[PDB]
Write an enzyme that holds these catalytic residues in place. Structure first.
Site, PDB file in Angstrom:
ATOM      1  N   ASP A  35      31.472  38.855  51.829  1.00 11.05           N
ATOM      2  CA  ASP A  35      31.388  39.447  50.471  1.00 11.05           C
ATOM      3  C   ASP A  35      32.633  40.312  50.259  1.00 11.05           C
ATOM      4  O   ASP A  35      32.644  41.499  50.649  1.00 11.05           O
ATOM      5  CB  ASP A  35      30.131  40.286  50.276  1.00 11.05           C
ATOM      6  CG  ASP A  35      30.069  40.876  48.895  1.00 11.05           C
ATOM      7  OD1 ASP A  35      30.904  40.474  48.061  1.00 11.05           O
ATOM      8  OD2 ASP A  35      29.201  41.775  48.659  1.00 11.05           O
ATOM      9  N   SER A 199      44.740  39.077  35.880  1.00  7.75           N
ATOM     10  CA  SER A 199      45.071  37.687  35.489  1.00  7.75           C
ATOM     11  C   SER A 199      45.942  37.728  34.231  1.00  7.75           C
ATOM     12  O   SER A 199      45.840  38.699  33.428  1.00  7.75           O
ATOM     13  CB  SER A 199      43.806  36.900  35.232  1.00  7.75           C
ATOM     14  OG  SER A 199      44.054  35.602  34.723  1.00  7.75           O
TER      15      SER A 199
END
Ligand code: NA
EC number: 3.4.23.22
Length: 330
Positions: A35, A199
């Site tokens: 994770d 991004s």
């Protein structure tokens, strides 16, 4: 040193991926959910409330000659999905894919929430976010990667998740055979303890690329791709009959649809998520309504590049002095 372990989807939808981890002496193998969005290594154990175990493999510290109680230490964690666990702490020998850490904090669950009990395939979590998120009190503990880092050939680990197929986590080396073209690296903020990056924009199917900064976390422990409501609406507008369902809890689409790809930017690079990756199947057995893999982050307070986005890429988690992310096509 290096390690290399295979990660296997737990079901036919790639809801999560389990990786076998050796704990203790002699080794007790447990299947853990790696994770990159959390920083606790915790396991089902001989200490877990009996009624809250339903088929998981448990760690039994009393059977490990290398286990030591970390006296007075406790932990308690709450995940984005409302699930939770808590208990006490042992140090032990932990090995992933041939890479061994002595004195790793193994957080032993006394209590787990219903979603953990209900998933027989996940024996616990191995967090790979920054150790500043670790919940052990009163002495915060280091992640497996933070403990291993100094011994690794290179201070990195990579995630190569499969689509309906096994993949790989590698520690301390980049496998230059596992990707195509070049790796594009992008800046990371550790201000929130996450692999947080920006991004450079997105496109829907064969559509034009929209240049726009999207701050988000690279999170192998989250199934889906959670993005701003503007982006998500632009995606599902291209799917006939797709709608946001309050009752179901996000975007659903007719199971007769062919879904368009989704592209996200990494600097000047582009990662294309095939439409098939965004299909999470019927909302309930037999339904012709299917659940979307791309969902709104509104309410969650962060964008999440979860497994839908990461399994389209070879991802490098560079744990150098100044951490960076790397994405490649594959
Ligand atoms: Na679900």
């Amino acid at each position: 040193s290096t390690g290399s372990a295979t990660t296997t989807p737990i079901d036919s939808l790639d809801d999560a991926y389990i990786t076998p981890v050796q704990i203790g002496t002699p080794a007790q193998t447990l299947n853990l959910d790696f994770d990159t969005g959390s920083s606790d290594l915790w396991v089902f154990s001989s200490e877990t409330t009996a009624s809250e175990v339903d088929g998981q493999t448990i760690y039994t510290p009393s059977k490990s000659t290398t286990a030591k109680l970390l006296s007075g230490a406790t932990w308690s964690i709450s995940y984005g999905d409302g699930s939770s666990s808590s208990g006490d702490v042992y140090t032990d020998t932990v090995s992933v894919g041939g890479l061994t850490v002595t004195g790793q904090a193994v957080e032993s669950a006394k209590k787990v929430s219903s979603s953990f009990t209900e998933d027989s395939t996940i024996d616990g979590l191995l967090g790979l976010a920054f150790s500043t998120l670790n919940t052990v009190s009163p002495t915060q503990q280091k992640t497996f990667f933070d403990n291993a880092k100094a011994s690794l050939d290179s201070p990195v680990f990579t995630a190569d998740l499969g689509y309906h197929a096994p993949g790989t986590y590698n520690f301390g080396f980049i496998d230059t055979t596992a990707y195509t073209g070049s790796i594009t690296y992008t800046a990371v903020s550790t201000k929130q303890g996450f692999w947080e990056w920006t991004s450079t924009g997105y496109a829907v199917g064969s559509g034009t690329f929209k240049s726009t900064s999207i701050d988000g976390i690279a999170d192998t422990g989250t199934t889906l791709l959670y993005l701003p409501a503007t982006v998500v609406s632009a995606y599902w507008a291209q799917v006939s009959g797709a709608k946001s369902s309050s009752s179901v809890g996000g975007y659903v689409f007719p199971c007769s649809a062919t879904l368009p790809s989704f592209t996200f930017g990494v600097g000047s690079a582009r990662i294309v998520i095939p439409g098939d990756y965004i299909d999470f199947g019927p909302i309930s057995t037999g339904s012709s309504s299917c659940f979307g893999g791309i969902q709104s982050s509104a309410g969650i307070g962060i964008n999440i590049f979860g497994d839908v986005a990461l399994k389209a890429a070879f991802v490098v988690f560079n744990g150098a002095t100044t951490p960076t992310l790397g994405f490649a096509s594959k």
